[model samples]
Target: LDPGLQPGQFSADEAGAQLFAQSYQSSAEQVLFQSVAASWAHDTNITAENARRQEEAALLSQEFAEAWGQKAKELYEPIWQQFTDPQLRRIIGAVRTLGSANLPLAKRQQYNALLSQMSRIYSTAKVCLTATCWSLDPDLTNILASSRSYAMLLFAWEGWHNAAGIPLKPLYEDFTALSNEAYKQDGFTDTGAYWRSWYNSPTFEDDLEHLYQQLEPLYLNLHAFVRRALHRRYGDRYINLRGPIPAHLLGDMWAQSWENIYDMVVPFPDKPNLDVTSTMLQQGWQATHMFRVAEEFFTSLELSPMPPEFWEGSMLEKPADGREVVCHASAWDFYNRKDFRIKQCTRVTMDQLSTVHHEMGHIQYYLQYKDLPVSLRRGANPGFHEAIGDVLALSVSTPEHLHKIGLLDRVTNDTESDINYLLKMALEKIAFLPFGYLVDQWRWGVFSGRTPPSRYNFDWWYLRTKYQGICPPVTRNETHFDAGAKFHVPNVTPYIRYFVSFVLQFQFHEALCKEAGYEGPLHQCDIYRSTKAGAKLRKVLRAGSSRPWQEVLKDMVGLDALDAQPLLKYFQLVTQWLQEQNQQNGEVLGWPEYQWHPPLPDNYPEG
Candidate 1:
C-alpha cells in the first residue's frame, strides 16, 4: 500500500526490491481476495447482487494484474535469484511469469464474464421430471443414489442432461473459443496445452496415458463384476451383458463413483456393513459433531487445530433462516492469513463424514502455510491440494480408524469382510479412475481440434464408452451439450487434477502409513495419533508451492513421478477377488469400443 512496484528496484537495491515485491503482492492479494472470496459468496447465496460483486472484483483484479506484469517484466532478471533467500527467490520466480498475461484486459474480461455466465447456468440448472423441477443437490442426488427403477432413473437422468446440457451448448462453445484464443496470446498453442503445463512436464500427456493404461485392467475387472451383477439382477431388458452399461444405471449422476450401487453388486450380503450412517445416528451426531470428529482426527496426528474463527465463521449446516446457500462442500481462506472457513450443507451420511474429514484436511493445509506469501501458499500443484484432503480421507475412512474413533463399534479382521470393504472402496476409488482421467481427456481432444465441435457430444459419449464402459440412457446427438452438464465444464475448472489426486492420495497414504509404523494390511493402516506421520506430512506441507510438486512429492514418497504402485499394492487382494468372481460367473471383461452408430432407445417416455 505504501509504494507500488517500480522498474529497476531490484538493480538499485536487492533488499529493497524484495520489499517492493512483497508490498505489491500484499496489495494484489487483497484485490484478489475479494475477487476470489466473492465467488464463494456468490456460491453460498446465489443472488444477482453477489454476481455483480463477483464480476466487478474480477475486472479490478485484471486491472491490478495488467500493471504488475508491466513492472515485473521490466525489472525481472535471472540474477535476482542469487540475491534473495531461496524462499524469496521462489517468489521472484513466480512474479516474473505468473504476473504476465498476454491476453488483452478487455478480452480477458470477456473471458472471465463468459465463464461466470456459464457457471450461473449450471448452478441454477433444474430438471423437471414432474411438474416440480428438482435441484441438483439433495433432490437430484437422492434420486440418482437411492432409486433403482429403470424408468425412474431414466426420467431423472434425461431430465437433468437436457435441462443443463442443451442450454449450455453455445455458451460453452463460446468459452472454448475465447479460451483457446486467450491461451494462444499467452504463447500456448491452446488452453489444453496451458493446463498440461501446470505439471511442469513436457511428458505430462504421455505420462497421463501411461497411468491410465496401468489402471485400465483394474477398472475393467471391477466393471465386469458390476455389469455381470447388474445383468443378473435387472436382466437384459436394461443391462447390456457384453457391452457398455447404461450411465444412469450406475448410482451417482456422473457414474464417476459407483459406490451408490454397492448393495446391488456387493460381493457378500451378510458381511459386516462398512457404512457409518447408522452408527452416526445412534451416537446422536449433529452437523457440528461431524466437523468436530474430523477436526479431532487431524489433532490425533498432531496437526494444527481449527482456530476459533473456523467454528464461529463456518456454515456447517444448511441454514433454515430463509437464506439459501450452495449445498456443495468447500473450504476457504480469506488471504488475510487469519480467517479460514468451510461452507457445507452437511448430511449425516457416512459419505459426508468422509467429506468433513476431506474439507478439514484443506483447512489444515491452509493453517500450515498461512505464514507464507499468498503466492506461495498453494500446493506444489493443483492436484496436491486435492490429494492432501483425500489422503487424510483414505486414513480416516478405514474400518480400524473408524472403530478407534468410536464411529464404529468394532473392526472385523476377516478376509471376506476385508474383500467387501476393499471392493466398496474400489467402487469409489478405482472405478473412478477412468472417469476422472477421461473428462479432460475429452476436453483436451476438443481443445486440440482432434474432436471438432460438430462431434462434441459424440466424442463425450465415445470417451465414456471407451474409458468408463458406460453409455447414455437415451440416444444423444450433437444437439445435446452433454459434457456441459458437469459443474467443472462451465466453471472452467481443469479436471486432470482430480485424476492426479486419485493417484497421489494413495501414494501419500502409503507414505504416511509407513511413517506411522503400521504393520498390517495397506487398507487397514491408520496414521491417527502418530506424531511421526504428522512430522512427515507437515514437512511436505510447509514447503507448499515454494517448490515444485515433484520435488515435494519426491521428498515425501521417495519417488518423484506420481506412483500408482502404492494404490495397486493396497488393492491387489481386491483385484484378485474380483477376477475370481468374474471367472466363476463367466463374465466378459471390458466393453466394445464406442461405435459410430451405437444402439439407442427407440423412444423415452415422459415421466
Candidate 2:
C-alpha cells in the first residue's frame, strides 16, 4: 500500500491490485505448466500430474472466492459475484474424485485399465465390410448420412455394432461392476450417484428431467416433421408411419445431429447453399489457410490475433512421422497466456473450415483472459465455451458472410432460403436436446440401481425410443451394450453440457448480431468485420470467470437466468414451419412407446 508504480501516487487498492495480479499470476503459471502439458500431448505419462494440479487450483480458487468475498472489500463485488455460489468446488471435486475415488490400488488399476482400453477400442475400432468391418466416424458417419440406399446404410450400421458395440460388452460389464464397488466404498451408492453429486443438488436429477420436459415439445415437433420428410423419401418399407424413427435411416452413427441428412429433410431443398467446401476446394485452401482465415476473422472483430508462438507450435494437420496423436480437435491453454495451440487433424472440407473457427474461439477466449488470475480464468458459464465455438461458426457460415468471403457468388436473403438455414440449425441444436437429456439420465438410473445391469441394452433403447424418438434399425437385445457406442458412455463425461451450449449459441448469436447493427432475421445476420460486435465480444471475453456469469449474461443478453427465449425466437420461423408441415400431413408430434426392447426373462425363481 505504501509503494506505488508512479513514484508514490496511488490508492492502496490500486497498488494492491497490480501486486496481487503479479503474485497470483506466478502461481497460475505453475498450474498451467502441468495442465497444458497433459492436454498438448495425449501421452498418459505426461498427464499424471493434472488431477493433482486440478485439486490444488480448485482449493486455491475456492479459498480466495470465500476469503475476499464481501460487500465493502476492494474486489468484493466481482469476487462475490463470481465465486459466491461456490458450486465450483463440488463440481471440481466430483470430477477429480471420479478418477481414483480414493479407492484401493487394485480397484483403481482395474477400472482405469478397462476405461482406457474401452476408449482405444471406441476410437480405433474399424470394421472392414468385406472382412466384416466398418468405421463409425467419417466412414460410417458419411455412409449413414449420405448414402440413401437403404441396404448400404443398414449394412454399415450393423457392421459398427459387430466391431465396437458387441466387442465392448464383457469389458464394459466388468468395468461397471468395479465402478459400483468403489463408488459405494467412497460414500456414494454407485458410479451414477457419484456423477450426479457433481451437480451439487439432491434433486439435480429432477432439474434434468424438468429441463427436458420443457424442451420435449420442441424436439417432438422437429422430430415429427423430419420423420414425415424421411417417410416421403424412403417410403414405408424402411420408414414407419409413426413410433420410433430408425436410427441408421436418420443419418450419423449415433444419430446425435441430423444435419448431414439436410438434403433429405431440408424444408426448402433448392434454397441458397451456404456450403463453402466446394469453394474452399476450388480456391485450394490448405489446413493452415483455414486457421489463418479464422485468425483474421477474430482480429477483424478487434479480438486478439494468434501470437507468433501459436502458428509455429500448433499441430494443424496429421503428422507424417508415424507418431500417433488423437485426431479429435481441441484448443490447448497453457496456464501461461503466451502459449495457446490447437491439435486438429485437419481435412479440407467446409465442416472442417467451420471447425477451424470453432477451435479458434477457445484459443481466443484463453488469450482474452490470459491476464486474469488463474482462479478467475474460464468460460463465464458451463455453456459459454461451446457457445463461443458455435456462435463463431454460425457467424462465418451465414449466407451473407459466405458470399462476402467469396465462398458464394450471391447471397439468398429471401424468406424461403432463411427457413432452409434455420431448419439445418434446428436439425443440429434442437434435434440434440432429447438425446443429450436422456443419456446421462439413463446412466443415473443405472448408478442409482433403478435400472439393473441386466437391462443394459434393453433399457438403453427403451429410453432412446421414448425420449429421443430414435430406435435401432436392427433388432437389439440384452447381449449388446448399445450405450457404449457413445464415446461419453465409456469415457465417463456428462452429455447435457452440449445441449446447454446449443441453447446459448443462438442467444449469443442474437446478441452479437445486434451489436453489429444487423436488422434482418437472426439467421441471416453476420457480424463479420464489425468492430462494434468485436469490441463487445472482447469486453465479455476479457473478464473470464472473474465476474459472475449472471452479470456477464446481462452484458450479452440482458438476462440473469440462462433463458432460452432468445433461442426460441431465433428459431421461431422454423417452429412455425415444422408445425404447419406436420399439421397438413397429420403427422403425430410424439412417438409411441415401442415394444421392441427384449422381454424380461421368467427364469428367476420366486422367493
Candidate 3:
C-alpha cells in the first residue's frame, strides 16, 4: 500500500523470467488461489477468508487482465517464446492471447466496482406486491410455477422485472462500454464472435445459427399452441395468437420457458401432472434427498459417488436466518479436487432436483481430473463442462426413469399422454432455444457499439420479438433495462455456455443411450446401470480440457463436429405431435400472421 507501481511496463526477459521461474505445481497453486478467491467473492458467508482472498485475486487478476493489451503484447510475444512444457505453453499462451483485451486501469477499476454493486443489488433485490415482500428465491419460483391466476402471475413477474430493471440500467450501460472495449482490444468486430471464441470450435457461431434454424419452426408451432391454449383459458385480453405472446403468461418470470403451465395447456386426463414439489412435500423428502437422487444416476452407472465430504460440506438449502447470501446455484471446486461444494437455496422441487444433477456433473468432473496438471483440469470446452450434468439430467428427468425410480406410478402409453409429456419438455428445452441464443445476441450488439445507450430496452424487446416470438406485458422505455432482469447480466457470467449446453446434452444423451444398447425410442432410453456407457463417459470426463473438445466429443460420439441431428431424433415424436396439433388448430406452421411493416433498423440507438 505504501508504494505504487504504475501498472509496470513489462520487458520480454522480465516477463519470461517471472513466468518460467514457477514450477507446474507453483502455477497450479496460483490458479487455485484465484479460483478460491472468486468463489469466496460470490458467497461471503462461507468464511472469514473472503475479503482478503478476494483482494489478492483482484490485484493478481487486474495485473493479468491489464498485462494483455497493446503495449504488453510487444513483450508478451517474446515471453511466450520462453515456455517449452505443453501445459506451461498453453497457460502462458492463453495469458498472452487474452492480454490483447485488457483495459486501462481506471476503466478496469470502475467496471469492477460497478459490477460488484450490480451483483449485490440484483442478489438482494426484493418485491412486495401483495401482503408480503418476496425475494427472487424459491418462493418466487413456486408462485410462478403454481399460480393459475393471470393477475397474480403478472404481478409477480413484473415485480421482479421492475426490481431488476430500474436500479440496473446505468450500471449496465457503463458495463456495456467496458464489454465493448474488451472486444475491441481483442480485435473482434463485436462481443458475439469474441464470446464464441471460448468454445474453441472453428464453426461455433455457424453451428449455433444452424441449430437455431432447425429448432425455430418447432418453436413457432409450440408457441402457437401455447398461445391458443392460454387464450382459451385466460381469455383474449392477455393473449393474442396472431402476434407475439405476452411474456407474463408464459409461466417463468422471464417467460423463457413455459414448463410450469403444462397442466393448463395439455389437459391430459389420463396422465396426472408430476408436481414433484408436492410429491416431495408429501413424502417428507428434504434437499439432501434431492442430492441423493442426483448421485443415484451416477452410481447406477458405476461412476464414483460424490466424495463423502461433498455432502458433509455443501450448502444444500437456504439458511434458516443469517447474513444475506446469494442463493444462485453454483458448483465450486477448491484446489482442483480437495474441496467441492454446491451452493444453492434448494427446495423440494423437481427443477432443483435436475439442478442437483447438473451441479454434481461439475463435482464429478473435478474428481475425474484431480490428478491432471492445472492447465489440463478443465472440461474439454466450457460448454462441455456445462453439459456433463445436464446430460445425466436428461435421463433422470424422463418419464420412464421417473417410473422406474417409483416417483411416478406408471408411465402412460397413450398418444394423448405422450403428446402432453412432449409439450411439457418442449416448453422448457425447445422453447428455451431462441431465448438462449438472443440474450448474448443483444449483448453482442451492445458490445459492438451497434446498440447504443438510447435504445437498450428498445433493442432488447426487438430481439426478443424477433427470436422468441414474445413481448413484454407492459410498456417499456429507456427507463427500463429488461436485460438486467436476468441474473447473468449484472453478474457478468458468460451466457452462451448454457445455450451450447442445451444442444450438447441431447447429443450426449443420444450417444450414451446407444452405448447402453437401448434401441426402442431415443427419449425412453435410460442408461442407468450401464457400465459400458459409464466407462465411455468417464474416459472423456477424465480427459478434462487435455485436448480440443472436438476430439473428446469424437471419442464419445464418433463425431468431430456438433450435430443438432441427435436433438431432432430425440424429439421426433413430439415434433410430429406438435405438427398435427398445429394443423388441427388451423395455425400457420411457423411465425404468426400479424406483422409490423417497419424494417428492423440497420443501426441501433437511432435518433
Candidate 4:
C-alpha cells in the first residue's frame, strides 16, 4: 500500500479514517476471492449446492460494494489529492466511483441475485438431440468438424436453440428490467452507455463502428466464396448468393463463425491438412501433455513458467465421471495475484489447443502484474486482457509455427495451399467480426430501450441479416429469446471485449513480429522465440491499469488507434486470391440486393 493509504497510529481522527480504508480494502478482496472460488467450483461441478454458493457469493459481493462505495465517498477524495504514486491515484479514482448507485442496495442485491441465477441456468443446460445427451464441447465440435450428415447437424443446432431458449426468456426479461433500472438510477441513458463508459474513451462506439465498416469488404468477399461453394454442394435453394445464407448451412450451430466448415470451403484438393485433433490422436497425447505444448510457446519467448502449484491445482479436463460441469473454457486468478488456473474440458481439437494458449496468456498477464499494489493488478482495460493470449495464439498456431514445433513435417510454401490456409483462418477470425460486434450492439439496443421486448427475436435475426448477411434456417417468433441462447448473454459477460480483442490481436501480432526482426510479409512472420518481443510485452503488461489503456497500447504497438490496416495487411494475399476465385466462378463479391422479409405475425413491429 502507498504511504497515503497506510493506517495511522498517533492521531485519533487519522487512525479512524485509516481503519475505514483498510477495512474496505479487505472486504473488497474477500468478495473478489470468494466470487472467483465459487465460480470455479460451480463451473467444475454444476450441482445445486455449488450453484447456491455461487449465488450467495455474488450477493455478498454486491453488499460489500455498497459499503465500500460509502466508505470511499468519505475517504477517497483526500487520498486522491495526497497520493503522489500514479498507481495509487488511478486505483483510488476507480474505486471512488463504486456503489455510486442511484438504485438502493436492496434493489441492487435483487438484480445481482437474478444475474447469478441466469448464469446457473446456462451452465447446467445441455443439448439432447438423440437418446444420448451431449455437452456443448463434444456436440458442437462433432457437428462442425466430423459429422457429415446434414440431418444430424440440423438436429444438433435446433437442440442448442431449444436448450438456450427454454430457460432464458423470463431470466432475460427480468435482467433487462433490472439493468434499465440501474441505468436510470444513474444519470446514464442506458446500459450500453454505461458499458461504453468502462473503456476510458469517449469515441469507442464510433471507433468500433468505423472498424466494422473496414472489415466489411474482407468479410463479404470470403462470405461470397463460401456461399458459392455451399450452393454448388447443396442446392441453390439452400444457399442464396444474392442475399443472406441459411444459418445451419455454415456448419456451425450458431453460424456466427465459419472456420469449422473449412473442409467444404477450401478450393484446392491438396489443401494443407492441419487437423490438430487427428495428429494428437495419432501421437497419443494426454490432457496434461496437450497443456505442456501450449506452455512451451510462452517459455520459448523467455516468459516465466507457471508455478508448480498452478499445475497441481488446475482442473485441465472434464472429469471421466463426475457431476455435470459447465465445461466452457475459462481462466481464473484466485487472488488476482497468484494461484492462477484454467478450467476446461480439454480435447485434442485445434480450437482447444488455441484456447489453451489463450488461457495461458491470461496467466502470464496475472504474473506480470502480481507485484503491483492490489488495486493496480488488472488489465489496462478488459479488452487488453483478452487480447494478450489471442495475440500469442495467432503466431503460435500459424502454419510456419506448427512446422517449426514438429506438429507438421513441412510447412506448405505453395500459393494455393497458402490461400487455403488463409481461408481457414479467415473463417474463424474475419467471419466472426460482425457477429462479435452485433452481440453487444443488440444488447445495447435492448438496454437503451431502442428495442422492445415484443421484437426481441425479430430484431435479433434482422441484425444478423443486416450485419452478418445470414438468416435463421427456420422461422423464429417473439416467444424465442434467441440472443439469450448464446452463453455470454445469460452469463452476463460484456461481449465488446471479444470484438476489441479480435482487432487488437492482429495489431499486437504485427507489432511483435516487427520486434522479432522479421523482414517478410506480415502473414509469414512469427515471434515464437523472440526475447525482444517478450521484453517489450513485459513493459506494457506490467503497467496494467495504472495508466490509461491508450498509453499502454501505444507503447506496445506504434499506433494508438484500433485501425484495421494491420488486419488488411495480414490477409492481403488471401483477399486477392478470393477475388480471383469469385471472378472465375462467375460469383459476385458481396451480398445481393434482394429485398426479403421474415414471415411474421401481422401485429409484429416493422422496421
Relative to the true structure, candidate 3 reaches a TM of 0.88
The window of 10 residues in a row where model 1 has the poorest summed lDDT is 1-10
Measured by TM-score, the strongest candidate is 1
The whole-model lDDT of each prediction reads 0.81, 0.69, 0.74, 0.75
TM-scores of all models?
A: 0.94, 0.80, 0.88, 0.91
Clash totals for all models, in order?
0, 3, 2, 1
Kindly list the per-residue Cα lDDT of model 4 for residues 252-275, writing each as its tens digit. 667777877787777785666765
Top-lDDT candidate index: 1
The runs of at least 3 residues in candidate 4 whose Cα sits more than 4 Å from the true structure, single-residue gaps closed, are 1-27, 76-86, 99-106, 183-186, 593-607
What residue runs in model 3 are displaced by over 4 Å at the alpha carbon? Answer: 1-25, 41-56, 64-89, 98-101, 182-192, 589-607
Model 4 local distance difference test score? 0.75
Residue lDDT tens for model 3, 1-607: 1113222443466445344324323444555557474755557463335534554465455564443323345655666556555455555555454422266767756666666678777888888744878988876777887887666666677788889888998888887777667666666665566777767767777888988888788888888888788878777555666777777777788888888887778757457666456666777888888888888889888888988778877888888866667788888877646677888888877777888888999998888888776667788888888988988887876777787876776766777666777677788788888888899888877777788878889899888889988777666788888999899888877788778888888889988999999997787777888999999899988997767788889989888777788888888888888888878989754446434222222332222
CA RMSD of each candidate after superposition: 2.6, 8.2, 5.7, 4.8
Q: Residue by residue across 94-153, what tens digits does model 2's lDDT show?
A: 222322434455565566567566766676667674355444545676687679966677
Alpha-carbon error at 494 in model 4, in Å? 0.8
